[PDB]
Amino acid sequence: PSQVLKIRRPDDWHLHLRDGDMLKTVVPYTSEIYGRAIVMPNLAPPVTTVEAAVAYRQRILDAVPAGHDFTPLMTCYLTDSLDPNELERGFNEGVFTAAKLYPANATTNSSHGVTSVDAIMPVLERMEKIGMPLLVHGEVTHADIDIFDREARFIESVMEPLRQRLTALKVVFEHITTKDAADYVRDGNERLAATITPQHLMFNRNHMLVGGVRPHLYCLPILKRNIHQQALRELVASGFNRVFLGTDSAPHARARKESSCGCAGCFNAPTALGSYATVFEEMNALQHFEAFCSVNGPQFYGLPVNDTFIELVREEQQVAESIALTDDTLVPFLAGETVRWSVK
Amino acid sequence: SQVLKIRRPDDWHLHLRDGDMLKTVVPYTSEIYGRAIVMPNLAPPVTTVEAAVAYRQRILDAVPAGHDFTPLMTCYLTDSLDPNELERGFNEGVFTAAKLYPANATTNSSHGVTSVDAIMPVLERMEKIGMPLLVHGEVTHADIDIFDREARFIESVMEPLRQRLTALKVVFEHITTKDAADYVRDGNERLAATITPQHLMFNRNHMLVGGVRPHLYCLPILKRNIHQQALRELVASGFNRVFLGTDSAPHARARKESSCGCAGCFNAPTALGSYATVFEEMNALQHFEAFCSVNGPQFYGLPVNDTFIELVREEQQVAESIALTDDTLVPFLAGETVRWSVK
Numbered sequence: 001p002s003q004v005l006k007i008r009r010p011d012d013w014h015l016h017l018r019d020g021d022m023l024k025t026v027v028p029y030t031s032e033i034y035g036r037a038i039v040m041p042n043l044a045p046p047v048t049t050v051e052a053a054v055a056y057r058q059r060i061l062d063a064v065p066a067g068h069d070f071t072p073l074m075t076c077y078l079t080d081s082l083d084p085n086e087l088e089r090g091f092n093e094g095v096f097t098a099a100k101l102y103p104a105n106a107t108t109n110s111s112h113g114v115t116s117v118d119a120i121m122p123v124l125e126r127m128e129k130i131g132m133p134l135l136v137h138g139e140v141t142h143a144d145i146d147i148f149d150r151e152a153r154f155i156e157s158v159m160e161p162l163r164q165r166l167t168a169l170k171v172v173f174e175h176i177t178t179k180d181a182a183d184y185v186r187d188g189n190e191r192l193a194a195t196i197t198p199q200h201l202m203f204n205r206n207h208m209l210v211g212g213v214r215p216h217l218y219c220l221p222i223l224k225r226n227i228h229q230q231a232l233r234e235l236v237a238s239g240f241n242r243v244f245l246g247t248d249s250a251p252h253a254r255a256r257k258e259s260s261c262g263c264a265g266c267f268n269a270p271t272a273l274g275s276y277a278t279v280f281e282e283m284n285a286l287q288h289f290e291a292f293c294s295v296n297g298p299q300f301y302g303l304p305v306n307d308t309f310i311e312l313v314r315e316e317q318q319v320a321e322s323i324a325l326t327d328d329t330l331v332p333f334l335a336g337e338t339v340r341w342s343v344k
Numbered sequence: 345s346q347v348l349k350i351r352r353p354d355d356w357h358l359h360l361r362d363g364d365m366l367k368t369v370v371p372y373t374s375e376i377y378g379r380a381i382v383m384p385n386l387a388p389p390v391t392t393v394e395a396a397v398a399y400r401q402r403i404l405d406a407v408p409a410g411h412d413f414t415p416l417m418t419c420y421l422t423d424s425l426d427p428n429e430l431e432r433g434f435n436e437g438v439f440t441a442a443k444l445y446p447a448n449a450t451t452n453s454s455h456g457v458t459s460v461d462a463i464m465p466v467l468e469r470m471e472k473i474g475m476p477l478l479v480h481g482e483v484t485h486a487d488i489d490i491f492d493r494e495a496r497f498i499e500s501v502m503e504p505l506r507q508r509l510t511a512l513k514v515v516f517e518h519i520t521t522k523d524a525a526d527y528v529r530d531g532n533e534r535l536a537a538t539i540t541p542q543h544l545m546f547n548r549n550h551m552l553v554g555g556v557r558p559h560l561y562c563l564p565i566l567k568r569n570i571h572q573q574a575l576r577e578l579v580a581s582g583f584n585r586v587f588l589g590t591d592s593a594p595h596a597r598a599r600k601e602s603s604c605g606c607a608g609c610f611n612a613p614t615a616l617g618s619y620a621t622v623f624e625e626m627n628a629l630q631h632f633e634a635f636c637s638v639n640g641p642q643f644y645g646l647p648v649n650d651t652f653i654e655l656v657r658e659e660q661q662v663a664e665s666i667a668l669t670d671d672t673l674v675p676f677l678a679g680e681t682v683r684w685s686v687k
C-alpha cells in the first residue's frame with residue numbers, strides 16, 4: 001500500500017494567474033488544491049486600484065470550476081503615483097490582502113512601478129500604520145550588477161535600510177534564492193518572512209545550463225549555484241516557521257519560453273505540491289511539510305488555518321508534456337517526468 | 345568612411361558541420377579567411393586519417409570557385425586512439441593538430457577523452473612530432489558549478505599536463521576567464537589561446553537579463569563581466585600568443601530554441617567586424633591585424649597569408665536568418681546594426 005501524506009489544505013502565498021484565456025486555463029490547477037492564494041498584480045496594465053482588483057477577483061472567481069473552494073487574495077502593485085488612500089481603502093474593504101513591491105527603476109513610468117523606495121515612503125508608512133504586509137521581489141536591477149548578485153545586493157542596499165526605517169512593517173521576502181537571504185530571514189524578527197518556490201529547492205543553475213539551456217527552468221530571481229540551493233533546503237528542513245509555500249507559478253505560452261528571448265517563469269502550479277513533498281522527504285523533514293504548506297503562511301498573515309484536508313500518495317505518475325491554451329500550449333514544471341508524490 | 349586594411353585573416357577554431365549545414369556555412373568562412381582549423385566533433389567524430397581526408401573533400405566540394413580557402417584538419421582524440429593513426433595523419437599533411445574534448449563537456453563530446461592518463465602515449469607522440477594540442481579546458485564532474493569548470497581545469501588538468509610534457513605545444517581554446525587569461529599571459533612560448541567574438545563582446549548578463557537568449561548560449565559558458573573585461577584587456581595589450589578563433593558553431597534555429605537548446609554561436613558571418621569593434625573600443629586597432637593574421641601562423645609555424653582585405657566603418661544590418669533546406673540558421677547579432685563590415 002502506497003504511503004499517504006495527509007495535510008490541512010494548503011494555500012499558495014505567491015501566484016501568477018494572468019488574465020483572459022490564460023487565466024481560464026491555469027486557475028483550475030490552483031483551485032483544485034489550494035484554499036487561498038496570494039494573487040500577484042503584475043498584469044498589463046497592472047492592478048493598482050481597488051476597482052481593478054475587484055474586477056480581476058471576479059474574473060478569477062468566474063474561472064474556478066464548480067465546487068472548488070478557492071479564494072483569491074488580491075494585491076496592489078506598488079507604484080510612484082499610487083495614492084496611499086486608495087491602498088488603505090482597498091485594505092479596509094478586504095480587497096487588498098497585501099501590496100507587492102517590484103524592483104525600483106528610475107526609468108519606469110509612474111503608472112507602472114517605483115523609481116525608488118524613498119519615492120513611495122508615504123505609501124509604505126501607510127501600510128506600516130494599518131498593518132498591511134509588504135511583499136518584496138528583492139533584487140536591484142541596475143545594469144552594472146551581475147544577475148546572480150542582484151538578490152544579495154538588495155538585502156544590503158534596500159531591505160535592511162527599509163526595515164530599519166519602518167520597524168513595524170510586516171515583510172515577506174518573496175521567492176528567496178540565496179544563502180544570503182536564507183540567513184537574513186533566519187536571523188530576522190517576527191515581522192520578516194519568506195516564500196520559497198519548488199524550483200529553487202529542487203534545482204540550481206547547473207540544471208538550467210549544463211548539457212543545454214533549459215528555458216523552462218529560466219525564472220527570476222535566477223537559479224543560483226548549488227551552495228544557495230542547499231541553504232534553502234536546510235532552511236525549510238529546519239522547521240523554521242517564517243518560511244512558507246509560495247509557488248511563483250508564472251505561466252508563459254511555449255512560444256514565449258522557447259524563442260530567441262525566453263520569458264522568465266515556471267508554470268509549476270500543476271506539480272508544486274508533490275515537488276515540495278519530495279524535497280521535504282529527501283531532507284528527512286516530512287514532519288515540517290504541513291507547517292510549510294498550510295500553517296506558517298496563515299500565522300504570518302493573521303489568517304485562519306484551513307480546516308479541510310487533502311492527501312498526497314507516494315505513487316509514481318507521469319506529468320503531462322503540455323497543457324493546451326486556446327492558441328499555443330503551456331509546458332508545465334517537470335513536463336514528461338515521473339514524479340514521486342501526487343494528490344489523491 | 346574609415347577603412348582598415350589588414351592581411352587576410354585565418355580562423356584558428358571553426359565548426360563546419362557536415363551535409364547541408366556544411367554547404368550553407370562554408371562560404372561565410374571561405375570568402376574571408378585564408379585558412380581555418382576545422383574541428384573534428386562530427387557525429388561520428390573524425391578519429392582516422394581516412395575520415396579526415398573524406399571530410400576535407402566534402403568541405404572543398406562546398407567551397408565556391410574564386411575562394412582561396414584551405415581547411416586545416418584536426419583529429420578528435422579518444423581514449424583508445426592509436427598514436428600511429430594520429431602520427432600517420434600528421435606525416436601525410438592531413439592532421440594539422442589534435443583536439444582534446446573532455447568526455448561530456450560539450451557538443452558531440454560523449455566519445456571524448458576521459459582522462460589525460462588514458463591518452464599519454466598519444467600526447468607523448470604529439471610532443472615528439474611537434475603536433476599542437478588544442479584543448480577544450482573544462483572539467484565535467486557533476487558536482488562542479490558550470491561557471492567554475494574552466495578555472496578548475498587549469499589547476500587540475502592543464503598545469504599538470506604542461507609540467508609533464510614540457511615541450512608540448514598547447515592552444516587553450518576559447519578562453520572565457522581572467523584565470524585563463526592570466527594563465528596564458530604568464531605562460532611560455534609553447535602556450536597560446538583563442539578567444540571568440542562573443543566572449544569579448546558580452547558577459548553572462550547579456551544572455552540572462554531581460555530574457556534568456558539561447559543564441560548567446562555556448563560553451564565555455566559566458567562568465568562575469570570581470571572575466572569579459574580581462575579578455576578584452578588581454579587582446580588589447582598586443583600579447584602575441586592570443587589569436588583569432590571564432591568557434592563558429594552553427595545549429596538549426598529549432599535546435600537552439602527548444603526546451604534544451606544546443607550550445608554554440610553561428611558567428612562566422614559577423615565575427616571579423618565584431619573583433620574590429622572590440623579592438624577599436626579598446627583603443628588597440630594597431631594590434632588587430634596581428635590577432636587576426638600573424639599570431640596564429642607564428643604559433644603554428646605556418647606562413648602568413650600574402651593577400652589583404654579591407655574593413656570599412658559603415659553601419660550594416662545583420663540578417664535575421666539564413667535559409668537551410670529544411671531549417672533556418674540565426675546568425676550571431678541577427679537583426680543588429682554592426683559597425684564594421686568587410687569591403
Ligand SMILES: NC(=O)N[C@@H](CC(=O)O)C(=O)O
Pocket residue numbers: 359385450451480561562563564591593594607608609
Ligand atoms: N562551444 C560551443 O558552444 N559549441 C561547439 C563546441 C565547442 O567548441 O565546445 C559546438 O561544436 O557546438
Ligand SMILES: O=C1C[C@@H](C(=O)O)NC(=O)N1
Pocket residue numbers: 016042137218219220221248250251264265266
Ligand atoms: O519576477 C518574476 C515575474 C514572474 C512573471 O512572469 O510574472 N516570473 C518570474 O520568473 N519571476
Ligand SMILES: [Zn+2]
Pocket residue numbers: 137174175220221
Ligand atoms: Zn518576483
Ligand SMILES: [Zn+2]
Pocket residue numbers: 014015016040248250
Ligand atoms: Zn512572482
Ligand SMILES: [Zn+2]
Pocket residue numbers: 450480517518563564
Ligand atoms: Zn570547445
Ligand SMILES: [Zn+2]
Pocket residue numbers: 357358359383591593
Ligand atoms: Zn569549438
